[PDB]
């Protein structure tokens, strides 16, 4: 594609939550670190343990930003400009195909914790986000 400037793409995801005050030196290539902060967030109940459909969101992707919105009321959960996105990582937990966005903060950073419906979906999200990273200059 290259309709990232003039149009938007929507994908199926689950929104687990947003982790804040995470060390800015976090390596998005590191499974152990990301899972460290995620597991810690789960023990503190800042993230849900298992995925229901109450966590069903639409991810709208464009050259301007990444937008997440609930499926119920479609109220906007968060809006992250592409230049505020440091990276996107696919972490495969057992049943959860986690897609984690390392983003800037509104030097610490934020981890947007998402869950794709499958492996190919997560890899697709990472590819699309890569293309978006590239079309913006």
């Amino acid at each position: 594609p290259d309709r990232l400037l003039s149009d938007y793409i929507e994908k199926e995801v689950k929104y687990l939550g947003q982790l804040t005050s995470i060390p800015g030196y976090l390596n998005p290539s590191s499974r152990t670190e990301i899972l460290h902060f995620i597991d810690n967030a789960k023990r503190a109940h800042q993230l849900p343990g298992h995925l229901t459909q109450e966590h069903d969101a639409v991810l709208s992707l464009s050259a301007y930003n990444v937008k997440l919105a609930w499926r119920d009321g479609e109220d906007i959960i968060l809006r992250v400009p592409i230049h505020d996105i440091a990276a996107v990582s696919y972490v495969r937990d057992d049943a959860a195909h986690l897609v984690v966005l390392k983003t800037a903060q509104d030097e610490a950073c934020c981890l947007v914790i998402l869950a794709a419906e499958s492996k190919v979906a997560a890899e697709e999200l990472c590819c699309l986000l890569g293309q978006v990273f590239q079309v913006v200059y």
Binding site: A87, Y90, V91, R92, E123, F133
Partner: peptide
């Protein structure tokens, strides 16, 4: 990690 894509223009 299974897959990682870096934004080379971050910041």
């Amino acid at each position: 990690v299974d897959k990682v894509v870096i934004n080379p223009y971050f910041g």
